[PDB]
Amino acid sequence: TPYQEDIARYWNNRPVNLRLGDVDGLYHHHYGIGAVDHAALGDPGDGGYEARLIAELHRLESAQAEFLLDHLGPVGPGDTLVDAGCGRGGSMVMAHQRFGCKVEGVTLSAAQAEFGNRRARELGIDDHVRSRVCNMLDTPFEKGTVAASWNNESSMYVDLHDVFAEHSRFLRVGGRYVTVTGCWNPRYGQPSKWVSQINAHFECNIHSRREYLRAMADNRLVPQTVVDLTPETLPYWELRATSSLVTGIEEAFIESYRDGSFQYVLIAADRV
Amino acid sequence: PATPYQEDIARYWNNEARPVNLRLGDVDGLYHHHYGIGAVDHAALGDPGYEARLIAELHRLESAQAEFLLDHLGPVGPGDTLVDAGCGRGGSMVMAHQRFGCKVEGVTLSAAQAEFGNRRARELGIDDHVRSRVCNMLDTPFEKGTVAASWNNESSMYVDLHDVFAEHSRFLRVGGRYVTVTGCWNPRYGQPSKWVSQINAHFECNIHSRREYLRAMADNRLVPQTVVDLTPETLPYWELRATSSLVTGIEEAFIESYRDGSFQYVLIAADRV
Amino acid sequence: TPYQEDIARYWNNEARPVNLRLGDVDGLYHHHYGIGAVDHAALGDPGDGGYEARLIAELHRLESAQAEFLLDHLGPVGPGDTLVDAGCGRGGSMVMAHQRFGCKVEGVTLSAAQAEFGNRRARELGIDDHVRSRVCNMLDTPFEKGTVAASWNNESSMYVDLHDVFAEHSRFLRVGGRYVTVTGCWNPRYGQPSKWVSQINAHFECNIHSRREYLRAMADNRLVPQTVVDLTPETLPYWELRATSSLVTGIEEAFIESYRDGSFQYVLIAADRV
Amino acid sequence: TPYQEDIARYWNNARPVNLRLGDVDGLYHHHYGIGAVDHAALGDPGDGGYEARLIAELHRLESAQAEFLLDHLGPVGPGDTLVDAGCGRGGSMVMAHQRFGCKVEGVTLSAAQAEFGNRRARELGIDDHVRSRVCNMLDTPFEKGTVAASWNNESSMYVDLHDVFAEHSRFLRVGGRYVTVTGCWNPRYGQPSKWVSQINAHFECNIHSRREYLRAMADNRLVPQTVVDLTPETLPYWELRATSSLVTGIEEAFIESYRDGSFQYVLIAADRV
Amino acid sequence: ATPYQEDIARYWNNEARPVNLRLGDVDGLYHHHYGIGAVDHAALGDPGDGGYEARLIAELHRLESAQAEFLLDHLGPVGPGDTLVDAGCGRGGSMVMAHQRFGCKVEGVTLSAAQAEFGNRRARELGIDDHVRSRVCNMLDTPFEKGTVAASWNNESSMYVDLHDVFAEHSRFLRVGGRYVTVTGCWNPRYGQPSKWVSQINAHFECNIHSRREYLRAMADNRLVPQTVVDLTPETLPYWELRATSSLVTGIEEAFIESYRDGSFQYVLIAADRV
Amino acid sequence: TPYQEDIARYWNNRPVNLRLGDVDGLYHHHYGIGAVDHAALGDGGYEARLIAELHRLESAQAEFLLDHLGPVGPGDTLVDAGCGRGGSMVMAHQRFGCKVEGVTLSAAQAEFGNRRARELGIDDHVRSRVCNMLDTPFEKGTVAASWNNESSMYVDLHDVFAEHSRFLRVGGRYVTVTGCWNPRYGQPSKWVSQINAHFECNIHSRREYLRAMADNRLVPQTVVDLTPETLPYWELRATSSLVTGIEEAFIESYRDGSFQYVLIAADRV
Numbered sequence A: 001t002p003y004q005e006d007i008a009r010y011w012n013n014r015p016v017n018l019r020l021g022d023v024d025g026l027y028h029h030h031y032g033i034g035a036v037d038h039a040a041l042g043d044p045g046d047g048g049y050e051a052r053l054i055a056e057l058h059r060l061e062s063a064q065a066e067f068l069l070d071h072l073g074p075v076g077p078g079d080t081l082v083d084a085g086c087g088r089g090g091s092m093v094m095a096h097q098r099f100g101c102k103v104e105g106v107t108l109s110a111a112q113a114e115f116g117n118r119r120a121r122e123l124g125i126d127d128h129v130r131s132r133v134c135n136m137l138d139t140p141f142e143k144g145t146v147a148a149s150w151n152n153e154s155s156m157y158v159d160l161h162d163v164f165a166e167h168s169r170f171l172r173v174g175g176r177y178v179t180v181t182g183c184w185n186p187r188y189g190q191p192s193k194w195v196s197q198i199n200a201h202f203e204c205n206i207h208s209r210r211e212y213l214r215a216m217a218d219n220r221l222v223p224q225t226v227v228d229l230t231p232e233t234l235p236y237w238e239l240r241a242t243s244s245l246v247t248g249i250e251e252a253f254i255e256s257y258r259d260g261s262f263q264y265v266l267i268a269a270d271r272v
Numbered sequence B: 001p002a003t004p005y006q007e008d009i010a011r012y013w014n015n016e017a018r019p020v021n022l023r024l025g026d027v028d029g030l031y032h033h034h035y036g037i038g039a040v041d042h043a044a045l046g047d048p049g050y051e052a053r054l055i056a057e058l059h060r061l062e063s064a065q066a067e068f069l070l071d072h073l074g075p076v077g078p079g080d081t082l083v084d085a086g087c088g089r090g091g092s093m094v095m096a097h098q099r100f101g102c103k104v105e106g107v108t109l110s111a112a113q114a115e116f117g118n119r120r121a122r123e124l125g126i127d128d129h130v131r132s133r134v135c136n137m138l139d140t141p142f143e144k145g146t147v148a149a150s151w152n153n154e155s156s157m158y159v160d161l162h163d164v165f166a167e168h169s170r171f172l173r174v175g176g177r178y179v180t181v182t183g184c185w186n187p188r189y190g191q192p193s194k195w196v197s198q199i200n201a202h203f204e205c206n207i208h209s210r211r212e213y214l215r216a217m218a219d220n221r222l223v224p225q226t227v228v229d230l231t232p233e234t235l236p237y238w239e240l241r242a243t244s245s246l247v248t249g250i251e252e253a254f255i256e257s258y259r260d261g262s263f264q265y266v267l268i269a270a271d272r273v
Numbered sequence C: 001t002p003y004q005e006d007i008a009r010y011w012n013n014e015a016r017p018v019n020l021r022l023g024d025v026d027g028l029y030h031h032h033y034g035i036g037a038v039d040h041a042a043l044g045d046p047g048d049g050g051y052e053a054r055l056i057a058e059l060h061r062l063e064s065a066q067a068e069f070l071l072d073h074l075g076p077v078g079p080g081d082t083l084v085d086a087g088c089g090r091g092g093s094m095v096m097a098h099q100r101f102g103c104k105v106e107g108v109t110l111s112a113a114q115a116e117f118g119n120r121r122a123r124e125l126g127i128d129d130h131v132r133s134r135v136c137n138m139l140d141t142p143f144e145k146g147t148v149a150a151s152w153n154n155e156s157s158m159y160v161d162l163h164d165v166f167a168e169h170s171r172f173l174r175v176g177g178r179y180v181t182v183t184g185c186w187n188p189r190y191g192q193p194s195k196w197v198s199q200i201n202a203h204f205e206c207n208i209h210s211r212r213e214y215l216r217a218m219a220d221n222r223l224v225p226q227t228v229v230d231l232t233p234e235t236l237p238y239w240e241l242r243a244t245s246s247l248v249t250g251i252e253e254a255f256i257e258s259y260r261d262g263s264f265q266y267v268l269i270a271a272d273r274v
Numbered sequence D: 001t002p003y004q005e006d007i008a009r010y011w012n013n014a015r016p017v018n019l020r021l022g023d024v025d026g027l028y029h030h031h032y033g034i035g036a037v038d039h040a041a042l043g044d045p046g047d048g049g050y051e052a053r054l055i056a057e058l059h060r061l062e063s064a065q066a067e068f069l070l071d072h073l074g075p076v077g078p079g080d081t082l083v084d085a086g087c088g089r090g091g092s093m094v095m096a097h098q099r100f101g102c103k104v105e106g107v108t109l110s111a112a113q114a115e116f117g118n119r120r121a122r123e124l125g126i127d128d129h130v131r132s133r134v135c136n137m138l139d140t141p142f143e144k145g146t147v148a149a150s151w152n153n154e155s156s157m158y159v160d161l162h163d164v165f166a167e168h169s170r171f172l173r174v175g176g177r178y179v180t181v182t183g184c185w186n187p188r189y190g191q192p193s194k195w196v197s198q199i200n201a202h203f204e205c206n207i208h209s210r211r212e213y214l215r216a217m218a219d220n221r222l223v224p225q226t227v228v229d230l231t232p233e234t235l236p237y238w239e240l241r242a243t244s245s246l247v248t249g250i251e252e253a254f255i256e257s258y259r260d261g262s263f264q265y266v267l268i269a270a271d272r273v
Numbered sequence E: 001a002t003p004y005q006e007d008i009a010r011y012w013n014n015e016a017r018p019v020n021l022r023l024g025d026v027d028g029l030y031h032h033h034y035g036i037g038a039v040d041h042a043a044l045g046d047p048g049d050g051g052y053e054a055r056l057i058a059e060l061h062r063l064e065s066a067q068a069e070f071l072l073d074h075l076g077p078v079g080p081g082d083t084l085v086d087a088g089c090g091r092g093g094s095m096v097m098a099h100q101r102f103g104c105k106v107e108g109v110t111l112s113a114a115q116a117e118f119g120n121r122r123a124r125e126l127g128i129d130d131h132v133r134s135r136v137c138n139m140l141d142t143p144f145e146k147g148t149v150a151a152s153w154n155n156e157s158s159m160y161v162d163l164h165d166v167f168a169e170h171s172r173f174l175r176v177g178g179r180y181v182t183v184t185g186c187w188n189p190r191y192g193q194p195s196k197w198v199s200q201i202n203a204h205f206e207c208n209i210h211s212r213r214e215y216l217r218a219m220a221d222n223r224l225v226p227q228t229v230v231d232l233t234p235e236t237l238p239y240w241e242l243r244a245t246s247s248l249v250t251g252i253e254e255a256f257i258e259s260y261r262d263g264s265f266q267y268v269l270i271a272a273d274r275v
Numbered sequence F: 001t002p003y004q005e006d007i008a009r010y011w012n013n014r015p016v017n018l019r020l021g022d023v024d025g026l027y028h029h030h031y032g033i034g035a036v037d038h039a040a041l042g043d044g045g046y047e048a049r050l051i052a053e054l055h056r057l058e059s060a061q062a063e064f065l066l067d068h069l070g071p072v073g074p075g076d077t078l079v080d081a082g083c084g085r086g087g088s089m090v091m092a093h094q095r096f097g098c099k100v101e102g103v104t105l106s107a108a109q110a111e112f113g114n115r116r117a118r119e120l121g122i123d124d125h126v127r128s129r130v131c132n133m134l135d136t137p138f139e140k141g142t143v144a145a146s147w148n149n150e151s152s153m154y155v156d157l158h159d160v161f162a163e164h165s166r167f168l169r170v171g172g173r174y175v176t177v178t179g180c181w182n183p184r185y186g187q188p189s190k191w192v193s194q195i196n197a198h199f200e201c202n203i204h205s206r207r208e209y210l211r212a213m214a215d216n217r218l219v220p221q222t223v224v225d226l227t228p229e230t231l232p233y234w235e236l237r238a239t240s241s242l243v244t245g246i247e248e249a250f251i252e253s254y255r256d257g258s259f260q261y262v263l264i265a266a267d268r269v
């Protein structure tokens, strides 16, 4: 909990995030994947370059969010979805618009919760999409009532075994769990300074790919897909590294992705 | 002669050389005892109006997946050593060497397949790099952490997952890479469907669930880097083979099980942590 | 579930004479096999018209014999105790159990047909208020924690995951309670499942486990075996006799042969809920 | 080891209730018996040679269980090797050899018992097949999977179950057979009753629960083939011994604990998978 | 429910040993453990006095209340709103001290209906019966709700149950971040196996002593991370040697003293956090 | 291994360390415990006296560690996982007169250790060598006692304890002084993460230490929190000029209890 408060007294308090959500209305708090489109990007000497760069970055960010939903498997309007650490509800809205089902979000930031519902009412879907302040480790959802859940870059803030144990609980048998995250590669040995820098920067705790796989195995979660998206997210960062929205953590990511001490992966497992 | 089962599973491959695996291995010289992946080039194939071209197409797909497997062995130099658990006739071994120019140690229960492999190995003039030998993949002679990469290309249904991965984990160097292409019944389905059981009775093997594969690896310091379902890629191969005359009579079991999702063809590449 | 949905359809139909014509002479319809020597006396000679009629009786006797043998390992059980039958079939064992202990006997099966058949026959005996079968997955039963005095799996554990099934029994089973199971498992001493075993799996569309899995699964679920006996020699007679009858289903060989070379074995395990 | 040290003390030190029985067959056993008592040929207290007949009866029952144990070692030829963890004076070892004519390696902590065993072994002219040696059953010199069958006849209460079974599992050949006759407190009872604790304090040992035995075996690739409770078979032995004059003063603890079911005498025969 | 406990309950439903009651009278606090800390021989003047034995009982009781106090020192911060649990509370000696020191709720649990009533009886006298309460119940299956207990402990009562099951329970009703403490005697795994001395103690109290190894592993398997692990053998030795010369002797003094000497048995204290 | 190269580099490549080693002759790469000799310290050559005080505290904890190695004769062998420059190794030998095998990833530290070892004329008893503490050459159960003095944050707990448990004799003694984030706090606080990024290491939770030992036949005999004892050391070092810039992270984390300095001595069961 003492750490939980650290996270709450954090997210309840950037440009590189809001200005992008300002274009679509979809506010994301994760990273992008995909080939940069230097077509619509234009050159650095145009009256509205930075404006086009923000659009490109946001596109990539919405791109991975969409990519995540592709692994939630078949899901009808009667099913319920859970978003552990939903942020401002960006992914939640997309999910609903795409499946027209119930989407329950959960976050530690009362600010993010309200922001999500606020934006939810505007779209007139507040009765299907709802964010609430709650710890993803102890959620109110009943056993096996959720068709699919996921963690889009929010698993570095909690204990893997405990979090997957929860998902496994409220997740229906045969249900689908997905997660996009950054984990230090066990093949490298131990967390490199780069990774530690990212932890100190976001005040989180990155896990190894080994922990992710073992944690899932110990919680009746059998991976159906395990793909390394590092090559897909590299473009996003290198582009963001040249912008002015830079937060100062770009190097840590780019470098760690380069030497392979850190990796961006996606895992979709079944609730067996 | 480890166990009574491995006596039958050994006598099997020692006394069984079907046309569907030889006639194909003939076109190249590389003999394969597994299945293929990828789309079918019907253009260059033509219609049944041919059989010689069909064998080439089937063989292409089979060599295609073998190549696909090697793509997941990661970087490997001429100084590294590779192990092939249940190498069969050495098809994959030859390709591996030609592609990396390193040592390739194969291991099989069939003395026939072993000799066949080395025989063909001498012809290519690589017998001093590529070598097959009669031995149980569960108790191999390779020393601890001396192997750069190993794999199981459709041969893990003949042994206990924990024991086999435990062995690989042993002789495999820290940071090494392990890969495996296999067919496992989907735990999402519940239990092995009749189709799967039919395949077991046909090949006298024991197919595992995707759950066992993942847990077994986790219990043996094997962290999966890639886990892809190749069912959609292998379907074409079977449907085509189903129309040929090389048919062995197990085509239906595969096609059907792949269809209803009770059985799946997957590829897993994990690191030796 | 997709798999279980398959076993439901399988049994909803069935109607094998080798199974009904035997439970007719008693009302105790069993869907398992039998142990014990053969009473060739009451058997007689094949050159008789009522021979087949006597063969069915003999086979049924052996089948009811093992069912009785199973109950012998449930330990002391009074009229106030509750018993569970994972995969009860038509209720053959359930009726015997009640008649023998006069207690509650809750059965559970995937076949709605078998369920109704069981209750139907249950009302005839006038015990429907003590013996009841219901359509439900033995892996997720409605019985409350530690309220069951004893439960068992009479040839039905090949249709589910051992850890999950024993975990359930361990749940609703009272501390100190007794669990029993009669099943066929491939002997790990042999190495791997022989073709014979695989043939049996494909035939019944099931999934036989190794004796190793049974023991480990129980150990991981607070189930300590009190008795572990190999009944292969006791069930052999049953099969060899059935192999000569006309009720033959075509899987007789697989069993006989696998039992012979020791790749497959018929065992009974009775463990305590620690 | 400090424990083993003083467990060796005990053993380097001759109960009449032990030697006097073994002096009738040359079969020096150090355990208890099973089987119903033959009152007829036993005798009536109203006679002189009664006690002499009682010793014979008790010894018979003790050799009876030893024989019963060997019945669970499965097939074993003259070429096979057997191990006796905590062999005592070699009683069971001699019987084993005479019955299978194979190598029988014994191991004990008591140098006295070792020499006694070999001494008696030379007399029978089998010292080149049957041999006892001072060594800890937890760290034996036998090579991996070279033993056809091993066992613990009332000697597992002196060591850690996981470690001891781990050892047996090591030197035991795959498919080999392990057997053990012992007394363990029934987990069904809850915890060790005073009776059991009294037995521990008496023999300076550490009785385990039936739960530990089963779990320990499962964790060491030992799958039980047979698990039978011999309490009813050993009761007669004790009740008879309770009336004799060889009484050591621990008879009650056993009889009572067997009665209330807090303690049980069981036999377990498992395969080395 | 269960043969064994069925006994333990019967066992304690008799008790009445003077080496317990005469020592609990001097103060009003009725303990059922042993003491720690050096002995004040000076306070035990002219052995040839009608008051020596009276002073010896006071000294022994002091040492016994001393360790009880020492245990509470490891319960960490605890306010009047928190709830504490005493697995195998005995007559409530430690419970009363705990409350007087923290003024919070103290739930005790024992198998002896006699000890339970005695505890509440004495609890009403102090006028704290609405905060301190003992009840007949198995510490392995307690009625307390999940994570509602701020701190719990086992003061020499863990030898009567299965470590994994008991710690699993504590871990259940114990709040996340909560504190668990336990003072007990366990045979040192460094010695090998339970020496006769230990077995004698088991047969004497009809219990089942565990190894320090089981304690540590059992806790690790139940989300209980030890913050402190101290061997109090040297601190409890004085208590026994003194008690060995008294007339309250129960006949188990030697087993303890000797086992503590050769190191086959040890008196330890463990304070872990509920992670 | 790739990570090992990083750490190797780190060490092959400070004054606050060697300066203090100049006085006694012992070179420690850890920290100190115990109260400060506030009086006899100062308020001209103040800095010279401050270095002596800091070094005293550092040698103090090193000594404190050896106190938990239990009885050890001249015939016994000791292992120092991540020995650094051999400071603790020398003290150990001078105190027990036995064999002291050290192991480090830095060839520089290894040679420095042996160099200094020859000067004291004990090179035939005390020896440092370049090797990974996870895969040491020592034979099974031949070591009487081993330890990790602030070096366990550079390796996997299960693997490292598994090794110690291997070469360590049954009944042997293992000790370790380290900093671990308190699981009671929840997760690693920024302070801890800052320390990781600073030393390029990976701090573990007290939970991992205890579980890892339990899984490797290592039963803790003593578990004491030395945070209050090491606080003085840091606050004093925070005012000196040897400051490396990581002082705050430590002091603060120790304060809010998100990070703790503990000592664990377990037996090889």
Ligand SMILES: Nc1ncnc2c1ncn2[C@@H]1O[C@H](C[C@@H](N)CC[C@H](N)C(=O)O)[C@@H](O)[C@H]1O
Residues within 6 Å of the ligand: A004, A007, A011, A027, A028, A029, A030, A084, A085, A086, A087, A088, A089, A090, A091, A106, A107, A108, A109, A112, A134, A135, A136, A137, A151, A152, A153, A154, A157, A158
């Ligand atoms: N323990 C926790 N319980 C619930 N939510 C948390 C917890 N820790 C962090 N979070 C939230 O997880 C989210 C992580 C963010 N990167 C947002 C992820 C979100 N999927 C998005 O795409 O925006 C933030 O809202 C954090 O506040």
Ligand SMILES: Nc1ncnc2c1ncn2[C@@H]1O[C@H](C[C@@H](N)CC[C@H](N)C(=O)O)[C@@H](O)[C@H]1O
Residues within 6 Å of the ligand: B006, B009, B010, B013, B031, B032, B033, B034, B085, B086, B087, B088, B089, B090, B091, B092, B107, B108, B109, B110, B113, B135, B136, B137, B138, B152, B153, B154, B155, B158, B159
């Ligand atoms: N237990 C075993 N140990 C070693 N080899 C085995 C074992 N079981 C089966 N095999 C061999 O593994 C191979 C399985 C075949 N499907 C061939 C696979 C081979 N990788 C190929 O693609 O040609 C055959 O050579 C089997 O004889």
Ligand SMILES: Nc1ncnc2c1ncn2[C@@H]1O[C@H](C[C@@H](N)CC[C@H](N)C(=O)O)[C@@H](O)[C@H]1O
Residues within 6 Å of the ligand: C004, C007, C011, C029, C030, C031, C032, C085, C086, C087, C088, C089, C090, C091, C092, C093, C108, C109, C110, C111, C114, C136, C137, C138, C139, C153, C154, C155, C156, C159, C160
């Ligand atoms: N998952 C399941 N849940 C409930 N019942 C099942 C399940 N799987 C199989 N069964 C039933 O288990 C029974 C197995 C049969 N051999 C009957 C066993 C029964 N004890 C008897 O001897 O009559 C059948 O009724 C199956 O339908």
Ligand SMILES: Nc1ncnc2c1ncn2[C@@H]1O[C@H](C[C@@H](N)CC[C@H](N)C(=O)O)[C@@H](O)[C@H]1O
Residues within 6 Å of the ligand: D004, D007, D011, D028, D029, D030, D031, D084, D085, D086, D087, D088, D089, D090, D091, D092, D107, D108, D109, D110, D113, D135, D136, D137, D138, D152, D153, D154, D155, D158, D159
């Ligand atoms: N750690 C040990 N290693 C080897 N033997 C032991 C050990 N501890 C006890 N023993 C022996 O275990 C034996 C137990 C006796 N009851 C003899 C058993 C023997 N199987 C018999 O049938 O007589 C004694 O000879 C002990 O010396």
Ligand SMILES: Nc1ncnc2c1ncn2[C@@H]1O[C@H](C[C@@H](N)CC[C@H](N)C(=O)O)[C@@H](O)[C@H]1O
Residues within 6 Å of the ligand: E005, E008, E012, E030, E031, E032, E033, E086, E087, E088, E089, E090, E091, E092, E093, E094, E109, E110, E111, E112, E115, E137, E138, E139, E140, E154, E155, E156, E157, E158, E160, E161
């Ligand atoms: N299974 C059990 N469940 C609950 N309490 C038990 C159980 N077994 C023993 N006890 C209690 O353990 C207690 C141990 C006694 N030494 C009292 C300890 C108590 N902390 C005291 O200081 O008095 C006894 O009061 C027993 O009643």
Ligand SMILES: Nc1ncnc2c1ncn2[C@@H]1O[C@H](C[C@@H](N)CC[C@H](N)C(=O)O)[C@@H](O)[C@H]1O
Residues within 6 Å of the ligand: F004, F007, F011, F027, F028, F029, F030, F081, F082, F083, F084, F085, F086, F087, F088, F103, F104, F105, F106, F109, F131, F132, F133, F134, F148, F149, F150, F151, F154, F155
């Ligand atoms: N894999 C490794 N094998 C051996 N040593 C290592 C390894 N990783 C890190 N280290 C050592 O970790 C040590 C950390 C130092 N603080 C040790 C100081 C030492 N305990 C002393 O007080 O002198 C460095 O000296 C490294 O040499």
Ligand SMILES: CC(C)=CCC/C(C)=C/COP(=O)(O)OP(=O)(O)O
Residues within 6 Å of the ligand: B018, B020, B021, B032, B033, B034, B035, B154, B155, B157, B182, B183, B184, B199, B203, B205, B207, B248
């Ligand atoms: C997909 C699965 C589960 C494969 C198991 C391994 C196996 C029996 C290979 C045989 O291939 P083959 O090429 O030697 O024989 P076939 O003639 O059938 O191609």
Ligand SMILES: CC(C)=CCC/C(C)=C/COP(=O)(O)OP(=O)(O)O
Residues within 6 Å of the ligand: C016, C018, C019, C030, C031, C032, C033, C155, C156, C158, C183, C184, C185, C200, C204, C206, C249, C266
């Ligand atoms: C140990 C093994 C292999 C058990 C098989 C369990 C099973 C499916 C029994 C059905 O018997 P049944 O009596 O209903 O059908 P049949 O009489 O035709 O065999």
Ligand SMILES: CC(C)=CCC/C(C)=C/COP(=O)(O)OP(=O)(O)O
Residues within 6 Å of the ligand: D015, D017, D018, D029, D030, D031, D032, D154, D157, D182, D183, D184, D203, D207, D248
């Ligand atoms: C748990 C069990 C059965 C322990 C028995 C230990 C034992 C055999 C002790 C002495 O040998 P002995 O039994 O030959 O001597 P005695 O018959 O005089 O007790």
Ligand SMILES: CC(C)=CCC/C(C)=C/COP(=O)(O)OP(=O)(O)O
Residues within 6 Å of the ligand: E017, E019, E020, E031, E032, E033, E034, E156, E157, E159, E184, E185, E201, E205, E207, E209, E250, E252
């Ligand atoms: C240290 C160990 C193993 C204790 C277990 C036995 C126990 C609960 C003693 C305390 O009770 P008590 O104080 O009433 O007993 P006694 O009358 O001997 O003081």
Ligand SMILES: CC(C)=CCC/C(C)=C/COP(=O)(O)OP(=O)(O)O
Residues within 6 Å of the ligand: F014, F016, F017, F028, F029, F030, F031, F150, F151, F153, F178, F179, F180, F195, F199, F201, F203, F244
């Ligand atoms: C969690 C903790 C405390 C880990 C220890 C990290 C470490 C190597 C400290 C000593 O460094 P050093 O002595 O080489 O340099 P410094 O002068 O900073 O102590």
Ligand SMILES: CC(C)=CCC/C(C)=C\COP(=O)(O)OP(=O)(O)O
Residues within 6 Å of the ligand: A014, A016, A017, A028, A029, A030, A031, A153, A154, A156, A181, A182, A198, A202, A204, A206, A247
């Ligand atoms: C993948 C990892 C380790 C994430 C940890 C940080 C986090 C939860 C979000 C970062 O994106 P953001 O949009 O919320 O913040 P920013 O884009 O400003 O970095």
Ligand SMILES: [Mg+2]
Residues within 6 Å of the ligand: A016, A017, A028, A029, A030, A031, A061
């Ligand atoms: Mg962003």
Ligand SMILES: [Mg+2]
Residues within 6 Å of the ligand: B020, B021, B032, B033, B034, B035, B062
């Ligand atoms: Mg082929």
Ligand SMILES: [Mg+2]
Residues within 6 Å of the ligand: C018, C019, C030, C031, C032, C033, C063
């Ligand atoms: Mg039938």
Ligand SMILES: [Mg+2]
Residues within 6 Å of the ligand: D017, D018, D029, D030, D031, D032
């Ligand atoms: Mg005797």
